[model samples]
Target chain A: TSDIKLLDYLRVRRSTPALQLSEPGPSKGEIEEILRLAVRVPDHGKLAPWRFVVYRGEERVRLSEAALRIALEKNPDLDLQQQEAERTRFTRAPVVIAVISTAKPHFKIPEWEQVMSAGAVCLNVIFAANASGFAANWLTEWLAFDPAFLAEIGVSAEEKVAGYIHIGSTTFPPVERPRPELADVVTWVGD
Target chain B: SDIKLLDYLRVRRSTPALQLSEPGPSKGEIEEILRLAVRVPDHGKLAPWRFVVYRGEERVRLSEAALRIALEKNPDLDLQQQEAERTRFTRAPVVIAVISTAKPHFKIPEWEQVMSAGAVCLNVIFAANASGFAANWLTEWLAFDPAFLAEIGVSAEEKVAGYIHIGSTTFPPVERPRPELADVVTWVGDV
Candidate 1:
């Protein structure tokens, strides 16, 4: 019998860069369906410590313009070409979903556990998107870490930006990256 | 028009640690699980995680080591508690500990590395499930214990992402409560 197909999918899964993405992203219904599967990750204490903010249609360009303004505010010396690049950052992908982590102190559950749950959600979003026939990239550029920009995006002081998942179509074939050697990263006990 | 992977993800729930019992993945299957576990989106290619496998006699050794460490911190534990700690890793045929070596990086932030480790933990669960096994990603008391971690070869700076217990289970997983989409999702530029 053949091995599980999911293993083959995972073995060769590759992320498409946001810049390489284009139009024909998941529809509104598909986006909602993907999120349904995305949140099934293991969250200890059942504290759903994450939420999603999706940008599509003109909203992507709108946020990209706002991000550019923030970039220019921090660095007035940015050339016109660099400014234009920032102005279209979010537009590169047809849809962008920000996974905001609402991890906080819990008596039984550590903050790290909650934070990691959000991380798991981010990857699941990518996997779900892939399963739905879309290319995705999970990224956290300067815009993600900028406190002023985060505040502009309505992320509260206590929370954080786990990742901005960009999803859309790509013409390029999936390419593989260098993977770590098993001997280098694994330790066997009771051998 | 349902996708197999999406269908799986939509209702996926962790098998409780106690619910998991072997015949677990074979030695070769365990190696494949570790290989797929590390195929996560690691920004900057930091590869900031490692895995430790416990099986066969090592599970007993690991439990006893945890018992000794548990006593070191809280000697007031009764016989029942001691037995609990001693049997932690014995229930599952195999336990793979994901160790996060995330730290301060000049370019890549530590948060990103931590999140990457989180993705690795989830992938382990996903891989195991895809391979016809039930798995649980857990970070109980022993996981947070620095002494126990160190004894298991995890360093002071590193932390346990989770201890993933993988084995065959007879019970079907019941879907748990998941957040409603409207409550946790926001659509930009949508009235």
Candidate 2:
């Protein structure tokens, strides 16, 4: 087996922290290319049961403000520091693609499978961004579950947030976190 | 900017289901691929996924049993349709089940666990593709049904992240309709 350019890279696909990430994400054309790879996932029955909402520049600021409003509504006594953190949520990265898992009924594919396909899109987009020389972080915080917050952001009641993929230029190569031990997680059947 | 990896992404399209054949990741490589598959980002230490590898007699047994149930469900299904179900699991030399072993966590929500499982499924596909093999991540109606999963030893608490079918392909896999991007992207700024 000719192990080429990706075995090592894929084995340790690391997530760049939002605090460490900076400006200059994929260009408009580059992002198009990233999304191009993003959608090339294993979609059962060819039901494109997912959606993307790209946030950049002013939109990212607006998303942070909207989410902050919702956060305050939930936690009226939230501190000043936490409120400031909320304001900068989406602004940390240049490109934030909100993957909407729009899994619904289909002819052959199950809804859970479709949801999983959307999740597949989340990781694919991350790899695409990294391929284009950008750092990425896939995250979903308190805002992801808030129905009102999601609705304001255009995510429907039926759909769920697969991930908010934050892509930007890496400040430094972040430390790779702990990985699962295959010995502990995997079980060989008929062993 | 090293676009070497990006170029690979352009060619990394989903292989046609029927176009794929024998020659999957070897036992050594499967172990390698599974290790790669589980390297997804998780918020807490809640390692929320597991894999079930299907091959050899297990494939035929699971496929035949599932197909029988499918035929029973759809009594009007033709011989051709029945053959389709029979071959679904056995067609690919290796079928890796990315099972979502999500649980209610105090810190990490169950939804996030499911998302992690989804990411796991995508990683398996990337590993398969990177290893010079063709792969297609899919899940049918049986993935959601309790009885079908029980037969395969999947838990009710867990969901199918994906059923990644890995094999060899003589023909060049074509890219399907990535002809555009951001058709769904919405800028949340300036009314």
Candidate 3:
């Protein structure tokens, strides 16, 4: 039997545009707890198919600069715009995490399933952060698909950046966002 | 059987894909959790997915590179669009990118394995939330871009399944709608 009340847990949500966040980030213990929670996701065939990358402090700045340089090269004409975008990447928060998905060669697991596992990791991280009393965001933009950028970060031909998570204190509270109804998205296979 | 694997399916909520504010788990914890999380449906012990950690300055560098490519792809793109692209990196403190390699297993069909990988991602998110983290799985235009994949070292045969972001929550989440069991379930009898 299933604890249908578990549905209550799944129904929870976090506000967007966090107004405030804790400093010093997650401690070693806290991080471990979050990861432990992440590990519990479903595995149909026992194929663990994902990985992670974490960023903080100077590292954020450096990466931001690198992204800026790449942006400039891509658009030598819009130097100002490119630089601004790069700056935001570094200045958004005190910490940043990068989710990387690398496909294992010749495996029994389907690529889609592996990718979904990686996506689950992203959610786990968010839930971990929430439990830890902080605010975070997941994002992917034009750069996520750039060839030059992927190479700079050492992403192999089999890997891609899943999302960039920004962690920090917010100046404002998170706002509510729209969601699609289940009836609109779900299709009935039977009665 | 008591573990309740489909809990998410019955009670899953649609995370506010954007505007998350929360702290994330630590590296050791995340790694440990992942260690267990990776054990998802494997048909023939053929691991079809891999993960890479990007921390510190790497996040900024990657974002900058992504922006560069964006500008290169569209020199005349407007400022708002450019800003939006850049914002992708700042959304979360941690980001995990999931890539899919269509490695054909000897006996297992590639499609099945790929689907399995996707299932893993979903499970990971469920686990993370259960453990107290907010996670989001996302994919952008870059995930499908061949040049970007090549630049990131993803082979032509590989697909960018998505990017996962993890971190703290800025606020509590609202309830999401769910489909009735009768809408999607069917019972077959000897009739």
Candidate 4:
């Protein structure tokens, strides 16, 4: 009989990078499919604690411009170096999906869990993208937490951007990243 | 403890080769499953997670899109490799992707809430398997790709937690290996 291996699934990693992206992000049909796949994350109180904003080609540019304006306003005398970093964020990939973590106050479900679920959604988005043939990356720069930027993007005070995911054809292969060893990270609280 | 529950916990395995039957679970069934799945531990009723479903030929399209990106990224990859990637989606008919949108709650640390989300994923897997479906929790390379996230419509505020693929078994179930509780558990404050 064929054996089921948890390690196989646990160790698997994405092979592509956003920079190498090409045509064929999930099509409309595929998006609907992925969304169908995405909505199944575990919710404690049935309180859906997150929302999504999908940005395409031109939208990505608009977002980038908005980020720049906010940055300039926050620091009228912005350094050239900082400005460049801000600009690159918007143009990093073909698409930028913004995930917002909305905090539902006074719910039995702790806000932390709600936020965690939102983060999980971001991860799901990345996986769904990969499943649909687009190299996706989860990113959150200072702008994500910046009030001005959040306000510009319409993120409420109770909500924050969990990530500014960039998706596209991979320009290069993914480099191996370091991971903590199980033993080092695991601790036995009680026996 | 119930042996069946223990077996479900210790010996349960994810079968990627299983294909879900057509029509899948109706909204009502899914809602039922989700309701059961959300009954996870909640310290403050923060209600940390949610669920979404993707079914039908959509899986095929996701696999195709994934293959297309693979080809673009690695033109040098052999045909066999390409086929392997393409077949990833065919392993199951329904893939439920979980998200963890962790937030900074009043006193509860983000880590605990995230763990709760993970627990929810585990519960969903158990619930699906108990309902007579083969389920596998998958978070492949695409889950982390930013570009892929944008294509799939995952906003910047979420992180993909896990993709639970459910379907009819293509192969027989295999025995699962688990760490012994005696070896892993420790007694504290013994009388």
Candidate 5:
């Protein structure tokens, strides 16, 4: 019944800034429901090519610290301001869900297509959070690229980070990003 | 149009090639489906995706061209595999090929563009399902074969995001096994 207005949200859907998000998450049961919604995306093949790792409570700070260690390995002469940003990355949100892509060589489908299915799951997580009246953003910072950091998080070398979705209550509506004009992107074929 | 959207998603399953049949959406309904499909998050106003459609007997014609490319690649192909290729496109009533033409951008990353196309494909899945039709997203061997893709005029810079098959279903969607939450979501920080 409420989905009529859902299209309005989709039309203007943009990521909420992590700093702007607050407490009061989807609660214990809602998190389960959210996962169910997340899986609703278009999938290819027998295997579930994507999976998630959720960070909450003290776990957020812990991973962000691991992220700092990886950052320093990339650059030893890093400033405190740059270093602090890494520590605060996961802590900025009440919940951080890491979407991992486990694309593989298949007899039928290409690896890239399997990879894209995982990407679709990332967006579905964002939409599920938004539809549930929570603010969310999907991101992949330096932590996502660093192999040492990924290994620490238990993500396999074969897998890629679809995104890290940060979810929490929003203080206000997200600022709308510019959308492409239909004329620019569309090509209508004449019969 | 009155799809209990989430309920639809929860029950929806991918119907294999032999299972799909006719009674797909017409030109007007497909117009509506395309409208709903376009509502996805895009960074920096780059749409990053386009669609190619195949319907009615067009599916047969396209599959024939695909067969030519497949035969050229492996002349010693068996009868069953060759027949599978011929009917692949005609398995569903309407097929929409979500093509990702993502490339390097000055500000926005190329990966995000590719992800946006992935999101677009997911949106198509929802759109088709919302219209009271079954939709399955697939990227078969032909999608990866550049020689066959050239027959359809898929560009060098472009990749097949996925081909979404939309049609009425003969059987109810069977539930698949979900990933075990405990196995996927790990607790890094213990109090």
Candidate 6:
């Protein structure tokens, strides 16, 4: 009998860097399915305090061009190499998702809790994309925090960019980072 | 087996904290759960979260400490209120407290670090659920009060992302209302 579980995925899962991501991303239907799975998280009070903005095809290039413009304005002395890096920021991956945290002040549920739910949703996007046979990278580059760039991209000032999930095929397999030892990160109480 | 994880995720639903009962995961299973819990996308490899586990007599100890803190803040509480605080942890067999140690970083933002801690909280619940135990991620008032946090050995610099309770449940999980895709999803070009 062959036995398997989600642990097998967790055991070897690693994020593929955005630069390493290539074409053959999930289709629009697959993206919808991924988002459906992404939102199925433990949302206390059912606030559903998150949403997604998807960029693909020529749309990714549009965002990347805006990022380059913002980068040059912020630092007028940027070298050509650095400028080109900004130009291709969102275009490296065929599909890029902007996970926005729409957490707000609530009488009972804390904003911290809502923000945390957004974070969970971001991870779920990665897992869902992986299951859909795409390599995923969750990153928040400098552009994510830039107010001018966010305004240009239509992200509201009130919303925080939880992550920019880059989804596509990878040229090579991603290498895993060393995880912390259990003794270092865990404490037993009343064992 | 690749689709197995996605298939399970599609129908995943969280079991309520109060519904969790005895016959929870054994020590070995708990250890395995913790291993997968830390397997998240930690930016800058900060590892900004740590786990404090409550099981056996510790859950009672934690509940009692919470009650004392509650009473100290307001002595006029009724017996029902006191009983509710006392039975908080006793409602489940295991509680894993995720403490976020996010701090100011020159490169990595504290927001991302805190978000990573949030992701860790969900991973704990997911791993436990995958192991055939029901789990709920919750953070009640006990998670916010400064005195209660101090009593639980959490430092001033750290905050509780969540307290995930794990155990068995006789009742099946019921699906809740999910967000409509039209409301939550936006295409860059279309918008």
Candidates in descending lDDT order: 1, 6, 2, 5, 4, 3
Q: Indicate which candidate wins on lDDT.
A: 1
The count of backbone overlaps in candidate 6 is: 0
Which is better, 2 or 6, measured by lDDT? 6
Per-residue lDDT over A1-191 for candidate 6, one digit per residue giving the tens place of the 0 to 100 score: 12235768777778888888888887788889889888888787788999899998887788789888878878887579988898899888888899999999988889999988998998888878888788998989887898998888777978989989999998786777889888999998886
Q: Across residues A56-127, which tens digit of lDDT does each residue of candidate 4 receive?
A: 656566667788778888888757987876776666676666767776774355665566566456655654
**Candidate 1: segments with Cα more than 4 A from true spot:** A1-4, B1-3
- The DockQ figures for the candidates are 0.58, 0.43, 0.05, 0.03, 0.34, 0.61
Q: Residues B1-191, candidate 5, lDDT per residue (tens digit)?
A: 45443444456566654676778888788777777677676767678888877887778888877777778888878998888788778888888888898899987788778878888887887777667777888888768788878877789998988888889887777777766666555544432
Taken over the whole model, the C-alpha lDDT of each candidate is 0.87, 0.78, 0.56, 0.58, 0.75, 0.86
TM-score of chain B, candidates 1 onward in order? 0.93, 0.89, 0.84, 0.82, 0.92, 0.94
lDDT tens string, model 1, A43-84?
A: 999989999999888877788888888888888775899988
Residue B176 CA displacement from its true place in model 1, Å: 0.8
lDDT winner, 3 or 4: 4
| TM-score, candidate number 5 | 0.84
TM-score of each: 0.95, 0.88, 0.48, 0.50, 0.84, 0.95
Q: Residue-wise lDDT of candidate 2 within A1-79, one digit each (tens)?
A: 1122666578666889887888887767787778877787777667778888878878788879988888888888668
TM-score of 3: 0.48
lDDT of 3: 0.56
lDDT (Cα, tens digit) per residue for candidate 2, span B128-149:
8778788877777767778798
lDDT of 6 by residue, B1-191 (tens): 13257677777788888888998888899999999889899988989999988998988888998889889889989999999999888889888899999999988999999889879988887788778888888899888988888888899889999888899988778898888889999987532
lDDT of 3 by residue, A60-104 (tens): 667778888888777776656557768666556666666666646
Give the range where candidate 1 chain B is weakest over 10 consecutive residues by summed lDDT: B1-10
Give the lDDT of residue B161 in candidate 3: 59
